[PDB]
Sequence to fold (24 residues):
Amino acid sequence: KKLKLALAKPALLWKALALKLKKA
Fold:
């Protein structure tokens, strides 16, 4: 189950992407 829509919305919303890269 590969959610290819991950490059559609999160890749257009760096607010939850950049802080996601700020993981640990």
In short: The chain has one helix and no strands. The radius of gyration is 10 Å. The CA atoms of residues 1 and 23 lie 24 Å apart. Helices lie at 15-21.
